[PDB]
Amino acid sequence: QSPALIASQSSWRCVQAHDREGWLALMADDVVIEDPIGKSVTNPDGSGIKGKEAVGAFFDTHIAANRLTVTCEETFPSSSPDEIAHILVLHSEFDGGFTSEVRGVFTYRVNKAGLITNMRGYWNLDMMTFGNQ
Amino acid sequence: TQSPALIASQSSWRCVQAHDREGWLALMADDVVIEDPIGKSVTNPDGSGIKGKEAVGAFFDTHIAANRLTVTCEETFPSSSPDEIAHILVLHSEFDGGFTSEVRGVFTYRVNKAGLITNMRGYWNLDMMTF
Ligand SMILES: C[C@]12CC[C@@H]3c4ccc(O)cc4CC[C@H]3[C@@H]1CC[C@@H]2OC(=O)CCC(=O)O
Ligand SMILES: C[C@]12CC[C@@H]3c4ccc(O)cc4CC[C@H]3[C@@H]1CC[C@@H]2OC(=O)CCC(=O)O
């Protein structure tokens, strides 16, 4: 198992586990999370969430007042043990029965130490589905 | 209006299928890097990708020579930036002599402000290829 694979798989288990300290242990001090890439609700300036404090906030905000599934549909290794891509499905269910889902490509890059420097999501609000119950 | 990233991605598969080398290079920024795949492999010998129009020209030549290359987009994943996009692509080679070669990967593309490809990056390796 490559470092990029251990890291990305560990990052889904830690959100499954709602395990904030284990999630942050996976991150480099210079981590940038672009979920999604570009200006969006979860990326207000289009530039990403930078550094472990900010990314901790991101974790805290995301796991609050909703059930947050991340399923790996498919994995695409590259030829670098430090970079990898996956198709993931994300489901949040907030209060009253709401309900957002998105399916995206996510790419991950780790440093020489095995820690996440980048996580990048290809999705936008037009691809997201809303529901009730 | 399709995004600059999507126009560029779709044009690059059209240029390849038309064996249009000048069309293909007109899509590229002068600082273009192509990592097909990311990391060391037959098509990325030093692992840092193919850099610049001249080198990316040579890449085009080597991939289409004696080859019936089809590039089929199975699925497209826009981002929230009109300059970055990802696709699942099936790259199918049928060389002269009849020998088949195939890979299905994730490819990401980035364009600059002019709409020219700065990056093209493939998530595949030789262990994923079929024959
Ligand atoms: C955009 C969201 C789903 C839609 C929600 C939403 C939907 C409609 C609305 O009027 C307000 C809000 C506020 C919170 C909004 C959510 C914040 C994160 C969530 O979407 C993400 O979990 C998708 C994947 C990810 O960013 O990890
Ligand atoms: C199939 C190739 C690796 C993938 C290249 C390739 C990769 C992507 C693409 O869009 C087109 C092509 C056409 C040329 C393709 C190469 C021709 C020979 C090369 O494969 C060999 O290095 C290994 C062959 C074998 O494992 O038997």
| Separation of alpha carbons A114 and A109, rounded Å | 9
At B13 the three-state DSSP class reads helix
Longest CA–CA span in chain B (Å) reads: 44
Yes or no: say if A85 and A105 are a contact pair by the CB < 8 Å rule.
Answer: yes
| Separation of alpha carbons B53 and B30, rounded Å | 6
At B11 the three-state DSSP class reads helix
3-state secondary structure B63-89: HHCCECCEEEEEEEEECCCCCEEEEEE
A35 lines ligand 1 (CB under 6 A): yes
Which residues does chain A have within 8 Å of residue B44's beta carbon, measured at their own beta carbons? Answer: 79
Per-residue tokens: A77: 């290794």
The resolution in Å comes to 2.0
* Residue B17: exposure state from Cβ atoms within 10 A (0-12, 13-18, ≥19): middle
3-state secondary structure chain A: CCHHHHHHHHHHHHHHCCCHHHHHHCEEEEEEEECCCCCECCECCCCCEECHHHHHHHHHHHCCCCEEEEEEEEEEECCCCCEEEEEEEEEEECHHHCEEEEEEEEEEEECCCCCEEEEEEECCHHHCEECCC
Q: How many C-alpha atoms does A111 have within 13 Å on its Cβ side?
A: 11
Residues of B20-33 as b/e, b for ≥16 C-beta within 10 angstroms? eeeebbebbbeebb
| Separation of alpha carbons B120 and B118, rounded Å | 7
Verify whether the Cβ–Cβ distance B125 to A38 is below 8 Å: no
Could you tell me what percentage of chain B is helix, strand and coil, using 3-state DSSP and rounding each to the nearest 5? 25, 40, 30
Residue in A78, A77, A129 with CA at minimum distance from that of residue A102: A129
| Separation of alpha carbons B118 and B31, rounded Å | 6
**Positive or negative torsion for Cα B44, B48, B52, B54:** negative
Residues of B83-94 as b/e, b for ≥16 C-beta within 10 angstroms? bbbbbbbebbbe
Residue in A24, A19, A18, A22 with CA at minimum distance from that of residue A119: A24
**Tokens 């193919």 sit on residue:** B50
| Separation of alpha carbons B39 and A1, rounded Å | 16
Please name the residues in contact with B99: beta carbons below 8 A apart, sequence gap of 6 or more: B131
Residue in B with minimal Cα distance to A39: B80
Yes or no: say if B78 and B7 are a contact pair by the CB < 8 Å rule.
Answer: no
| Separation of alpha carbons A36 and A47, rounded Å | 10
Q: Which ligand is nearest to the CA of B63?
A: 2
**Tokens 């020579």 sit on residue:** B65
* CB-defined site of ligand 2, < 6 Å: B 42-43, 63, 67, 69, 91, 93, 101
Q: How many CB atoms lie within 10 A of CB B69?
A: 17
Looking at domain A1-133, which of 3.40.50.800, 3.40.50.300, 3.10.450.50, 3.40.190.10 is its CATH number? 3.10.450.50
Q: How many CB pairs under 8 A join A and B?
A: 89
Q: Tell me the CATH class for B1-131.
A: alpha beta
Q: How many CB atoms lie within 10 A of CB A85?
A: 29
The residues spanned by each domain of chain A are 1-133
- What type of residue sits at position B63? H
Per-residue tokens: A38: 């570009």
Q: How many CB atoms lie within 10 A of CB A53?
A: 10
Backbone angles phi, psi at B21, to 5 degrees: -65, -40
